[PDB]
Nucleic acid binder design. Structure first.
Ligand SMILES: [Cl-]
Ligand code: NA
Ligand code: NA
Ligand code: NA
Ligand code: NA
Ligand code: NA
Length: 1283
RNA sequence: AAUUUCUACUCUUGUAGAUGGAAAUUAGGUGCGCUUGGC
DNA sequence: GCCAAGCGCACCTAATTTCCTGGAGGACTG
DNA sequence: CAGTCCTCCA
């Protein structure tokens, strides 16, 4: 029966290993002498130049084809709707197949097989497409079929720089096939049209229809927005939101226009922007009138379309020009400062503002658009000035002060510019003082800016800061002058207005200078990157096979446990085999690898037999057999039956499974399969590369049930590695003459002083070449390896006479906090320029310092030029390339192991990751925040690093990365979770994110569990390098992933945190529906009673689940009724003796004590309650709307079981119901058997949703897990278990 | 405070854990500036 | 001061596709 | 023309 250790050898997994290459002997001298590195750098530069030129072909051809497309989209819309309505596997597969049909319909324009075009157009498209993804791109013929464009002399020079080297673009050809493909892939144009953009467009049509039906005036507003922007002039707004128009939204220029209909168009900074549809809808909603509420109740924002693949983005909005050099910025700005000094702008400003101390301020106006900005800059609140003006005007109203009259005043303050005197009269004399102080500050800073010289360059950050500081100062004055109203309607002071307008015009360039300087100063400087090496060989390291060593140029050696890469360049322009001679293993030398590989038999056997040019030709005019002798030890016969079998008039081929599905003719399928397999055996016995391979371990041909099973057993026999000794002198002579470039393949596990455990990747590599792996392949060495040169890129070091400081104290446990560490490091190195702090001096006797016995240099690896080697490998080589029924295999194990434990993993409000381990019946075994891992607080480090990056962006300084820190943290999390999973043999349950540290964790966890090696395991145990664990399903993409990946499950997050762990109770009410006095009264009427319990001092509020249904979330759960408790607010103590108050709530933030507040309420009302009588009828019959509102707010507070206060560290769960043993859960008791806080409660219930899935799997007769967990099924399940 | 590379380290000229590359594309985010508005 | 809808710029981050090849085939050489 | 070696098929 099933065994946890059986989750091994299930599917092949590919990885890349990376090593440094250390040149040996004269290798580096020869490489430098030959100029290979400079030549490889030039080739990479030429590629970078030539790629955008070649992409003109693809862009132009794709755009020309897409302009012809005209499809009917009704069927795709119908399949989308049916899947959304039904949400079944049947309607999902219908949509998937409909999407394929539409993608193919688009693709048929590219390849010229669409009925919607003529034969002549289709034929030219086929001729173009035939040469789009090979070296025919380079001859320029396709240019004639696309337009009148021809190549410039510089372009021809780039093209000829790849003569006899166009295979440098081989990968690029594949990247472009990914653009035009009809497959369901995100890189491709058909996918982009069918699955990204059409659903968005379809939804926009629906949004439009609902909006203009409800509010018909929106139709005219939308039409006028379209007319005002001047786009789609020939199409009515209705037609823009109808399916046929989508055929006009497939090219980028059209997509850009549509998105600008939605988003509007900006001109230069500081001028009014042209509004699009979404702004019009937003403004209509912010009017807050009756129509606003209606619009707000409907979907009210249109969805922009994604860009078309490869296409250039265009915009109608204004684009600033760019500064191009340090000297352009500094000189241009310095000229501008000089003009401002000459124009006397600052003296004029100072004189204008000084005039405000004596001129008539009733004719100086503040812009109503600026009043809240000014209030924030001058007062203590953004609304201080608005409220003051409101209060003053209220006190000036004549007669009775109506609500309407007060509203009129409020409206006026949004529509009218305010004279400065009214502001001063309304706000008081302290407003004038703040005004004076702000003006003096702004002017004084602008002054110091005009006087201070600019730096010579912008190379140092301190020089950038001078530039930014002066721009900040002039922008401040620019902002200040814009405080004053510009509208012609105001009775402006004429001389003051003309003077203010003058210096404003002179200040207008400041805004453009500000943005232009930022856009330049914040550009990232040119950086050193590694580049690919070819040594002038187009297929360098493309494969390792013995027969191609001369042409691929690459071989491998082992000597004394060290590994070497040998590169064999051309000799005087010609390839020359080195012909190393095997010798006795007694001879001193190197072991050279001999690699034999006949690639994927599914493609390679047809390529070398049935698909030969002479065979295909023969079977057009003949039915007789043809016999092949070239590279066959005895002739291989090809019959018409065999040929037809692999070349059917129409797919599928008869020996594939698809033929047995579609036809249902199993006698024929099993006949064809046996015949084709027999043919491959005939081929393999005769082809010179394979004739010596012993294939007797394969089963009789008839016994294979399908071809993939046969190839999965065949392919491991077609790959072999062995070694032969090569004499020392032959290798050293070859390096001396320059026929062999020899590099040690290096990482630090090969260092002389190495003595610890190796990296996993080193174990993969030494495992690959171990005797056991050579005898039976678990790990294959793959071709398509790559070599790189990385020029140095850094110049901080611990010099020899200095001291180093351990981060941990003498006890080797306690870390030194960051601020003390730097101070103590300076102190012990006699570089502290001040007193040691008290705490640092207290730590001083317990620090550990190290004498620098040998220089240790930060970034040392980046401070010299290096060579690198990237080499792919494949693990689990005995398995098929993809698993069959992985999840069912796991589920069979899980049904046979009903005691399997469960690891729940949650993302928390105050915890990056929180884990709870439960046994199979829900008992908590372990629970733990992972903010801190081994005394390092990654939570704090990440938060600090993000604050640094924000401050850096604001300061125009180097931002740097946070991804490397996130990955370092997550690798520690991975290590911990995997260790728990292996120790417990547990399932792991994560949040289903369809309901960033946590999402990145999910992918790394899945990926680790596709191929899990534990470096301490013996190689031959499951989990050792030659028998990796495989516990998750093969990863392909997140979008293509269900709710199960082997031992990993995904569950919805709702009702996992705000749920009582002892009962499964959740707050059933939707508080947005309890709005006003009448519904509040109905809400209280829906409870059976509220009464005081004199025995305990609690209040009990009895609720039956079938009452108050209009206020409920529609989730009755399992219990017919609940006793909601107002807990007596008494002192309790946790496990450590710390007090807390029972029943406390944290509400928006104050502490609230509901039982005590209820008592105070009842005593205020004179309502008798100590007799146990029902309180609710007394409140209801008395009908005090404030008392009733307080009652309902108290009920809402009691039902708020999660209570958090970031300032006190509180984040607890206190249930409002008692469980079957009388207990009201409170996490503040800190009972380690229950969730210790709210995030732990979330992880606990995440795990229990996994338990629900395992329980239902157990009770089912199949091996399929249920897809999804509805909220009601979850609540009924968990409440039934707990009650 | 050394690295294939990342993170955390320093008994140890190195230690612990992680690490699928390259190409191509697309999406999103942060920050700054600006527009019309809401509070 | 915060927020909504939106436009411009700077750089950072992550997801999703492909390949992980020997030898047939023929263009280019001398 | 025969040998070389870049290109790209299956
Ligand atoms: Cl929740
Ligand atoms: Na190690
Ligand atoms: Na990559
Ligand atoms: Na942005
Ligand atoms: Na604004
Ligand atoms: Na914005």
């Amino acid at each position: 029966m099933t065994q946890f250790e059986g989750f091994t050898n299930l599917y092949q997994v590919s990885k890349t290993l990376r090593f440094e290459l250390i040149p040996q002997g004269k290798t580096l001298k020869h490489i430098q002498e030959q100029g290979f590195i400079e030549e490889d750098k030039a080739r990479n530069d030429h590629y970078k130049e030539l790629k955008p030129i070649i992409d003109r072909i693809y862009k132009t051809y794709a755009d020309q084809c897409l302009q012809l497309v005209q499809l009917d989209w009704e069927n795709l819309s119908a399949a989308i709707d049916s899947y959304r309505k039904e949400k079944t596997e049947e309607t999902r597969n219908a949509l998937i197949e409909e999407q394929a049909t539409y993608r193919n319909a688009i693709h048929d324009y590219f390849i010229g097989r669409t009925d919607n075009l003529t034969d002549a157009i289709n034929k030219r498209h086929a001729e173009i497409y035939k040469g789009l993804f090979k070296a025919e791109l380079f001859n320029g013929k396709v240019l004639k079929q696309l337009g009148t464009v021809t190549t410039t002399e510089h372009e021809n020079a780039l093209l000829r720089s790849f003569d006899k080297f166009t295979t440098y673009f081989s990968g690029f050809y594949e990247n472009r096939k990914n653009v035009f493909s009809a497959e369901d892939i995100s890189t491709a144009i058909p996918h982009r049209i069918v699955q990204d953009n059409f659903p968005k467009f379809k939804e926009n049509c629906h949004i439009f229809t609902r909006l203009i039906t409800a509010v018909p005036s929106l139709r005219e507003h939308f039409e006028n927005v379209k007319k005002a922007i001047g786009i789609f002039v020939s199409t009515s707004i209705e037609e823009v939101f109808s399916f046929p128009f989508y055929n006009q939204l497939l090219t980028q220029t059209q997509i850009d226009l549509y998105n600008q209909l939605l988003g509007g168009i900006s001109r230069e900074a500081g001028t009014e922007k042209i509004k699009g549809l979404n702004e019009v809808l937003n403004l209509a909603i912010q009017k807050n009138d009756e129509t606003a509420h209606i619009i707000a109740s409907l979907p009210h924002r249109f969805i922009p379309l994604f860009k078309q693949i490869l296409s250039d983005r265009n915009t109608l909005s204004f684009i600033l020009e760019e500064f191009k050099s340090d000297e352009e910025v500094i000189q241009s700005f310095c000229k501008y400062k000089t003009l401002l000094r000459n124009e006397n702008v600052l003296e004029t400003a100072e004189a204008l503002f000084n005039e405000l101390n004596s001129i008539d301020l009733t004719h100086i106006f503040i812009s109503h658009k600026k009043l809240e900005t000014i209030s924030s800059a001058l007062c203590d609140h953004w609304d201080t000035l608005r409220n003051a003006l409101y209060e003053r005007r209220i006190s000036e109203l004549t007669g009775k002060i109506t609500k309407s009259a007060k509203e009129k005043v409020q409206r006026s303050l949004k529509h009218e510019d305010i004279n400065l005197q009214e502001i001063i009269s309304a706000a008081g004399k302290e407003l004038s003082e703040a005004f004076k102080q702000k003006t003096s500050e702004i002017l004084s800073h602008a002054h110091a800016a005009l006087d201070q010289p600019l730096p010579t360059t912008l190379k140092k950050q301190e020089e950038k800061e001078i530039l930014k500081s002066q721009l900040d100062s002039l922008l401040g004055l620019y902002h200040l002058l814009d405080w004053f109203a510009v509208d012609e309607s105001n009775e402006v002071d004429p001389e003051f207005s003309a003077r203010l307008t003058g210096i404003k015009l002179e200040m207008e360039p400041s805004l453009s200078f500000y943005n232009k300087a930022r856009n330049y100063a914040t550009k990232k400087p040119y950086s050193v990157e590694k580049f690919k090496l070819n040594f002038q060989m187009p297929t360098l390291a493309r494969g390792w096979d013995v027969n191609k060593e001369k042409n691929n140029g690459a071989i491998l050696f082992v000597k004394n446990g060290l590994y070497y890469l040998g590169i064999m360049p051309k000799q005087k322009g010609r390839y020359k085999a080195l012909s190393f001679e095997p010798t006795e293993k007694t001879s001193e030398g190197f072991d050279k690898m001999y690699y034999d590989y006949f690639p994927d038999a599914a493609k390679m056997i047809p390529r070398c037999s049935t698909q030969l040019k002479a065979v295909t030709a023969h079977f057009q005019t003949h039915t007789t057999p043809i016999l092949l002798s070239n590279n066959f030890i005895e002739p291989l016969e090809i019959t018409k039956e065999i040929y037809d079998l692999n070349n059917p008039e129409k797919e599928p081929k008869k020996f594939q499974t698809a033929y047995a599905k579609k036809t249902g003719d199993q006698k024929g399928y099993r006949e064809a399969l046996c015949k084709w397999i027999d043919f491959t055996r005939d081929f393999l016995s005769k082809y010179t590369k394979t004739t010596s391979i012993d294939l007797s371990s394969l089963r009789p041909s008839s016994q294979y049930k399908d071809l993939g099973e046969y190839y999965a057993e065949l392919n491991p026999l077609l790959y072999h590695i062995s070694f032969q000794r090569i004499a020392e002198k032959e290798i050293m002579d070859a390096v001396e003459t320059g026929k062999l470039y020899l590099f040690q393949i290096y990482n630090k596990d090969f260092a002389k002083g190495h003595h610890g455990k190796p990296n996993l990747h080193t174990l993969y590599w030494t495992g690959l070449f171990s005797p056991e792996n050579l005898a039976k392949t678990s790990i294959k060495l793959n071709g398509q390896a790559e070599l790189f040169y990385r020029p140095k890129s850094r110049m901080m070091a611990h010099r020899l006479g200095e001291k180093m400081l351990n981060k941990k104290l003498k006890d080797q446990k306690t870390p030194i906090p960051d601020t003390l560490y730097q101070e103590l490091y300076d102190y012990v190195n006699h570089r502290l320029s001040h007193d040691l702090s008290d705490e640092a001096r207290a730590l001083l006797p317990n620090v550990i310092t190290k004498e620098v016995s040998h220089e240790i240099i930060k970034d040392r690896r980046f401070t010299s030029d290096k060579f690198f080697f990237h080499v792919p490998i494949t693990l689990n080589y005995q398995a098929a390339n993809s698993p069959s029924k992985f999840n069912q295999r796991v589920n069979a194990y899980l049904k046979e192991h009903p005691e399997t434990p469960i690891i729940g993993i949650d993302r928390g409000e105050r915890n990056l990751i929180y884990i709870t381990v439960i046994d199979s019946t829900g008992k908590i075994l372990e629970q733990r925040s992972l903010n801190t891992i081994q005394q390092f607080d990654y939570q704090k480090k990440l938060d600090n690093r993000e604050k640094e990056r924000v401050a850096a962006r604001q300061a125009w300084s180097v931002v740097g990365t946070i991804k490397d820190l996130k990955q370092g943290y997550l690798s520690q999390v991975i290590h911990e979770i995997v260790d728990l999973m292996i120790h417990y043999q547990a399932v792991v349950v994560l949040e289903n994110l369809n309901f960033a540290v946590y999402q990145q964790f999910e992918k790394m966890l899945i990926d680790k569990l596709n191929c899990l090696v534990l470096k301490d395991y013996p190689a031959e145990k499951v989990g050792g390098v030659l028998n990796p664990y495989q516990l998750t399903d093969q990863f392909t993409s997140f979008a293509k992933m269900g709710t199960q990946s082997g031992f990993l499950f995904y569950v919805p997050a709702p009702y996992t945190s705000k749920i009582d762990p002892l009962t499964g109770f959740v707050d059933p009410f939707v508080w947005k529906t309890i709005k006003n006095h009448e519904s509040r009264k109905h809400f209280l009427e829906g409870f059976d009673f509220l009464h005081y319990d004199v025995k305990t001092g609690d209040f009990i509020l009895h609720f039956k689940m079938n009452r108050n249904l209009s206020f409920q979330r529609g989730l009755p759960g399992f219990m017919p009724a609940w006793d909601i408790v107002f807990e007596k607010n008494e002192t309790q103590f946790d496990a450590k003796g710390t007090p807390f108050i029972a029943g406390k709530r944290i509400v928006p933030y104050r502490d609230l004590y509901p039982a005590n507040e209820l008592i105070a309420l009842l005593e205020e009302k004179g309502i008798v309650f100590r007799d146990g009588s029902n309180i609710l009828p007394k409140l209801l019959e008395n009908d005090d709307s404030h008392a009733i509102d307080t009652m309902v707010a108290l009920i809402r507070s009691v039902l708020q079981m999660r209570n958090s206060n970031a300032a006190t560290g509180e984040d607890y769960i206190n249930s409002p119901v008692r469980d079957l043993n009388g207990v009201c859960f409170d996490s503040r008791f800190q009972n380690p058997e229950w969730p210790m806080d709210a995030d732990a409660n979330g992880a606990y219930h995440i795990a229990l949703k996994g338990q629900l899935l395992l329980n239902h799997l157990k009770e089912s007769k199949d091996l399929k897990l249920q897809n999804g967990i509805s909220n009601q099924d979850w609540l009924a399940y968990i409440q039934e278990l707990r009650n």
